[PDB]
């Protein structure tokens, strides 16, 4: 009773639920408004990191490349590139700041070195992803005004997109293997799947928050005799503070994974 029961949460905000499910172990798919466009917020740094893996794999990016932190450019939320202004830093460090500690100024750093937001989308259009488009740099894309398309996915193609990059071969084993690494360090969503994930599950998750009372996550769980299930969970147009919209993406996660 999946649809019944968000429906009614859905019912008590006044926005919009998202959420899309792949278990490929028992290979059932769910989604509740699946196909429709939601902001991206935070949930893009996984997308941004998969480019420069890529460019990494192919040669067009050095492994060891580093790019300058200007003070100019340290924008809001940069717990660590806040302290690297006038230095150099590796791109594959400001990668792990995005990925571990969402740091802003490091998700920049990253898409300016890679060709910005339009090569992030050639390169989930190259891997099949035709919906998910990334517009603006951090904090601008995080405007979530409804209506417009700029900086947005949906949560299916989130779920499609992540179980591309981790099982098919959009990346080499070894750079999937540090992108999953990245998603399971994760330290920023403590408050969300996690808080609600029962015990023999490993997860590798990315989220992000946003304007219009909007949330999101990205994740796949596993166990070592359990293929990995593959979640989206993105709100939208509320009124909600962020404790509270942590709490409504803990609560979708608690009807996911009564199931199991």
Same mark, same amino acid.
């Given at each position: 009773? +999946? $649809? ?20 490929? &172990? !028992? ?56 302290? +690297? ?14 990925? +571990? ?32 488009? +990334? ?16 900086? !947005? ?24 293997? &540090? ?45 070592? $005799? ?11 147009? !509320?009124?909600?503070?962020? &404790?509270?919209?942590? &709490? ?13």
């Amino acid at each position: 009773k +999946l $649809n019944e029961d968000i429906s009614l949460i859905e019912k008590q905000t006044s926005g919009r639920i998202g959420v899309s499910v792949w278990d490929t &172990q !028992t290979d059932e798919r769910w989604d509740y408004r699946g196909d429709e466009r939601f902001p991206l917020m935070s949930t893009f740094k996984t997308l941004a990191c998969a480019t420069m893996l890529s460019d990494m794999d192919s040669g067009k990016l050095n492994k060891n490349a580093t790019a300058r932190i200007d003070e100019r450019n340290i924008v809001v939320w940069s717990p660590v590139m806040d302290k +690297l202004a006038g230095q150099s830093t590796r791109i594959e460090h400001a990668c792990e700041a995005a990925m +571990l500690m969402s740091d802003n100024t490091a998700a920049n750093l990253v898409l300016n070195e890679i060709g910005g937001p339009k090569a992030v989308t050639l390169f989930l259009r190259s891997i099949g992803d035709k919906a998910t488009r +990334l517009d603006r740099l951090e904090p601008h894309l995080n405007e979530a005004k409804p209506g417009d398309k700029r900086d !947005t996915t949906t949560p299916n193609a989130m779920v499609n997109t992540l179980h591309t990059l981790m099982e098919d071969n959009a990346l080499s084993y070894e750079s999937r293997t &540090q992108l999953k690494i990245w998603m399971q360090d994760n330290k920023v969503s403590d408050s969300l799947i996690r808080s609600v994930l029962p015990k023999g599950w490993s997860i590798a998750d990315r989220s992000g928050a946003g304007n219009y009372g909007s949330r999101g996550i990205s994740a796949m769980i596993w166990k070592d $005799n359990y293929k990995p299930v593959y979640i989206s969970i993105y709100v939208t147009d !509320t009124d909600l503070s962020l &404790q509270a919209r942590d &709490q409504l993406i803990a609560q979708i996660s608690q009807l996911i994974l009564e199931h199991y």
